[PDB]
Amino acid sequence: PTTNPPTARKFIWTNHKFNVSATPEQYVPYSTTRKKIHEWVPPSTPYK
Amino acid sequence: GVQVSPSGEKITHTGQVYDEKDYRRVRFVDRQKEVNENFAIDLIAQQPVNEVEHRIIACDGGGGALGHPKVYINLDKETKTGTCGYCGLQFKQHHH
Amino acid sequence: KRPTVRPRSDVTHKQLSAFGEYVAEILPKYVQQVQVSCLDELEICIHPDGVIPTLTFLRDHTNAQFKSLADLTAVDVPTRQNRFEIVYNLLSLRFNSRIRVKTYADELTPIDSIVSVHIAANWYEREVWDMFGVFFFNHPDLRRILTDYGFEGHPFRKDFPLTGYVELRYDDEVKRVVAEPVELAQEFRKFDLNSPWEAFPAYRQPPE
Amino acid sequence: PSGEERCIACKLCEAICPAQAITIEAEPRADGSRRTTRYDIDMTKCIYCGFCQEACPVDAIVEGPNFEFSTETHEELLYNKEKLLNNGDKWEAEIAANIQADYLYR
Amino acid sequence: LGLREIRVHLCQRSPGSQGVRDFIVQRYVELKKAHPNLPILIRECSEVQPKLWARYAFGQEKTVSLNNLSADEVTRAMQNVLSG
Amino acid sequence: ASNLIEVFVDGQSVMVEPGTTVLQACEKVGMQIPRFCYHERLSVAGNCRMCLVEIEKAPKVVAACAMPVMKGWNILTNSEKSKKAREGVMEFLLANHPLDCPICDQGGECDLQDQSMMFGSDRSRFLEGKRAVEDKNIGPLVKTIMTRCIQCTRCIRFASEIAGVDDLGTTGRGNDMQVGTYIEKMFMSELSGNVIDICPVGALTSKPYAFTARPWETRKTESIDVMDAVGSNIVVSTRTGEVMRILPRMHEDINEEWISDKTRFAYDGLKRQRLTEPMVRNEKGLLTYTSWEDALSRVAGMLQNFEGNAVAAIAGGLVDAEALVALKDLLNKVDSDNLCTEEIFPTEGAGTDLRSNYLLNTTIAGVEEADVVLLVGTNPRFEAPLFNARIRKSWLHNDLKVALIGSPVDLTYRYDHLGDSPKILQDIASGRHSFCEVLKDAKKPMVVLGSSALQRDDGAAILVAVSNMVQKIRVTTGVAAEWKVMNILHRIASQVAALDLGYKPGVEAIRKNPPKMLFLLGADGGCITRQDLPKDCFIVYQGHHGDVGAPMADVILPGAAYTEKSATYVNTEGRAQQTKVAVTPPGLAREDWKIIRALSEIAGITLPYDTLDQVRNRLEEVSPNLVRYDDIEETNYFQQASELAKLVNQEVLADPLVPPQLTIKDFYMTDSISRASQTMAKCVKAVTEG
Amino acid sequence: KVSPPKRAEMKTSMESLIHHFKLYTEGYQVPPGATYTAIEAPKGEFGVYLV
Amino acid sequence: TQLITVDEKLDITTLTGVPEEHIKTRKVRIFVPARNNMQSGVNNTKKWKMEFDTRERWENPLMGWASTADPLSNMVLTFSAKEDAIAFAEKNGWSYDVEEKKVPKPKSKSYGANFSWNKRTRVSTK
Amino acid sequence: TSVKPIFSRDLNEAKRRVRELYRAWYREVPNTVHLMQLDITVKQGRDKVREMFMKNAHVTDPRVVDLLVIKGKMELQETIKVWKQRTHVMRFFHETETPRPKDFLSKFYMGHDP
């Protein structure tokens, strides 16, 4: 990649990162979907 | 762009973020929740509208076989640009 | 001629039809059906009482000489009364041929083991018993061969679940490997991959 | 090259995935595009067979040449959409070159 | 002890329900006239035994099988249920 | 073989009636001819040319969907000519069809894709550029991507014949001929998701279902709809434990192939405003989450405190017969007969004693069978859309004569509006009416009285007037004893089951004897409130949605929904059906009869049943027709009911019969799930503003 | 209908895209029947009995 | 000599190996599956099917996947006859609910009805 | 209602085979507990064997009883020559599983399972 450099894109990382396992910057999984069932919210005022 | 909740947690491009009282952020305690910084909706909003001379345009996303399947977009509505269903590029007919 | 269609030779079909007639008229007491497929493979479906005479005749006949047992298997079709279809594939090295012998059984009628005819039938019938629960008479040692020790149920049956009923994990309180009722972190997603349109009109069943 | 995600939430990768290692959830985005809200691939369930990258109609999911990603926990191999997009942004300078080198065969 | 509900289960077509059908045809109307506050629920089905349920106070139920009973002793069974 | 002709399919002989098409003979034999424009419930169009088959000794292939078999025809369905015709027609469709399969909602549900794989070629010769058509905005329910449209006119024929709107059509000519509306018109009637059903391509897709799931991954659960009292058979499509779609089921006696728009698109209300945990009022008067043990202990203590008329229950609309008989048994063990429903039926005369007094006795096949239908005080188009669809089908095919007493509403067919006054019942019963002599000309009349009309103050007077009218009609027309004229149309799913189980209809008993402890089994109509209820009253609301009954309750018990429980619902015909479990209730919500049984056990009066089959046994021993699933056993004793009605001496009011639902905006929100649905909110906004 | 088409044909043609979709979602339908195919494996005879 | 008499209901629950919870507490459904109304094909309405009652599917705390606790969630069995499904269900000891095959009613289809002189079946468009 | 017997013509010698199998299991339980170093005692192992037999005791079909005897002989022989290990033997007791009480209140408090 000095005579034939790769194609430049703006979303490509400008800084390469090595394996970051067992580091504070490691990968932690999570569900990327939002809340699916919305609970009823009781009113904040008493009926009596 | 990446925004933060009142909890301080970054909100993903899907709109997902944990609540203040949700216990599932202990997985991010002493670690990081990684969110992809490049938001595709913002990046495709930055793209200019291609100004073409035809009533029906053809899109493959560029690169020929490296792109998406070739589709045809009908640019009849002059009040709305035609959007590719695959790549999200916008096209507008030049009627001048 | 056609590069996408498998070529067909009818001499094998004629030879296997002649041999099927031969076996059928030699053993009318047991042979229930004889068919030759489009793949030129001879299938002979027999009564369970004639497994020993049929296998012995096919192994020891001068015209048959089916001295090599290819495999012994079972197919679970739980819509018929005798739900286990036991299939014997045999190979004749003298005549360079292959034959298939089919019979039927259910959960409560065992069939005769053919360990006296072929020796690989020992382990193959052990596999069939372990996977389907088909008992075999006069076996030297019929026991489980593939499942876990003390595994309850026969797993190759159609009504047995894919994931099973128990799963193993190490419990530190008892310091052992213990069995739990099975719980999956992600359930196996079943897919209904059947088109609503008929594919092969040659196999169109008549309406009920 | 615009920066839009190539994935169009068409679920053929998880339909063809022989180990059922891909889980996809989708909804229309705020601009109405057909995009995923969840794209999880389990490395501990994946068999690395390339069926997703050969069934993908828009070359979105790929098996890039990274193999030195062994982790110290079982969780870190449970990839989600953010991790897969980060991998795609990291390895785009090489994945695109490999696809350019080999795409005439496939 | 106070009667709260009467339920008559019968058949549209059965020899055992013929007397019950006759009783409902000729005598149910003035029964409802005499007790126009009591639910006499008439339920009929294909293959049920002719059965009579009397629900009293606090959930007690008395069950009387009136299979192959004609109109007059169906009437007297109803009278015994109403009175006690 | 009287009036039958012998034809041959692939050499196999079969008897067919005259007028039977080639496709109908082929499916009688057992082979499904390929089709794109033919639908067995739509009119024959014959334009897609996919059903072309070869008749023996005939040089030209014929369209099986339109051509009738003549005599002795040998239909060579799998011949070379038929295969070549199918290949050519699929090639012509896919020449201009767009490459949109991954971005298509019709992923594995595509008749075009499946028939391509089964009958078409495996490659293309189309080297030209494909056409493209701009999309339309016919509503927030049906998303239109008209480039995928193959111009089969199925949507146009459906809208013309079944929906009865005449709004869709083809504009243009040749390859430029576009299906849609010429003007910017919003196509929103009831029964409008069935165009999404019957569109074979993904041109007309569902906008709530847009880009959500795939048919191969969705699991199918065959259940019953509870949005109205028709009881339409449905499939709940659930993926990963979440309800994803609602589709109709084919049931020729209830709903045919279609479901209402509220049924199809109101499923998203089950994801909002859901009760998940039991709640109790605290010392500050606010609802707070608590445990099942604590909530049931509080309710059990109050139930041990009170008895008699001081304990009462009110049942709403989305209530199954299991919880109804559970609450009935519990209040009977505390000796309470105030088991009321929100929906009102007249108790005068026969009341709910005779089952024929409150049923659609003629039923929906009887709607197809009848010749004149008189609708009294009802708007069937919004009260029971599939019932009105069957009326329109009979009106098209059997030349049904429809008349209406009530306010003049658009029923998507032309009827005779006799007027909105209830005195016309007296006039027809006396026999001095033009429609009375129309009836005496007719042979098999059908008088359908609305439960919405029975909701009025003079409901008993209206019912006895209609009963007297029907008795006079049967006297003056001499109909058969097997033919039932009187019918009652209900709009509430729980009402028929409650009336069968013995619930007293209406809250008149509640108003007469105000209780100190009240159960609200899904009661969200607001019929009885704290203003006409005593001050120190203990309210427990058992339900799945917090809409009207939860904020006024002292204890809230989260029950299950119809998609979350296996349940019994009885339709207007009297037919009982059971919903199956599609998903499970969210949070700590349980099945409603299980909640009532656990409450009874804690209160110390244990109900004599523990399992669902034992609940069905209790239902059978109360009334043994709620266990006869999909059974239409007929009722009798209309003579006795009419005699008691005649001895009822009430008089009708002068108010015109105005149904509560005059417009589709009133149609869209009816119950708690519809009110909590955002899709119905969008529909109301679209039909009001847009 | 059995083997998937080339990717350029899939991205250009309608039938190729449809067949790619159906093959990579449902797969090809095999006509009913039973076969025993045995080949000379390096370890012996490898047999497959497909029904 | 080799033929005995048995007057029972052919119970094999002791040999199936299934736990007693998944025998006694399960309900099965025997039915011809309804045609998917998004299509018009009827090849999936030919064979009888037995399925089990739906059990609990909850959310995984880590990934949000659909976690389950019952093994008979994806178990669907195919039968050529309702009586065969009945025999299998009674043999395996599962309590069954059976619904009959819903066949489409025969319909009088006439292309000439679209162009009638006096009937209401005349269409206004094509 | 006439079928082919497996080993037993009727219930009598089937019960004889049951008694022989129970006799041999009762013999082997102390040897099992001593050889595979089980935490259990001899008494409750014999109780486990007995209540397994009482669990299977409701069947009266001679073919099913013969097959149960055959399976019991396989389990017993598998215990004679030690292939079934300590974990496999201790799987009979479910000591690591919290049992589900059968009352309606408890099954209501846990979840939706009947």
Ligand code: SF4
């Ligand atoms: S490479 Fe992995 S993720 Fe892709 S289809 Fe194969 S097993 Fe599935």
Ligand code: SF4
């Ligand atoms: S990764 Fe590719 S195959 Fe998978 S859903 Fe996205 S676009 Fe489709």
Ligand code: SF4
């Ligand atoms: S309608 Fe069918 S053929 Fe057309 S794009 Fe959609 S899936 Fe493909």
Ligand code: SF4
């Ligand atoms: S929109 Fe659909 S139903 Fe209407 S003509 Fe086009 S393909 Fe047919």
Ligand code: FES
């Ligand atoms: S189905 Fe007959 S031409 Fe369309």
Ligand SMILES: [K+]
């Ligand atoms: K569609």
Ligand SMILES: [Zn+2]
């Ligand atoms: Zn594009």
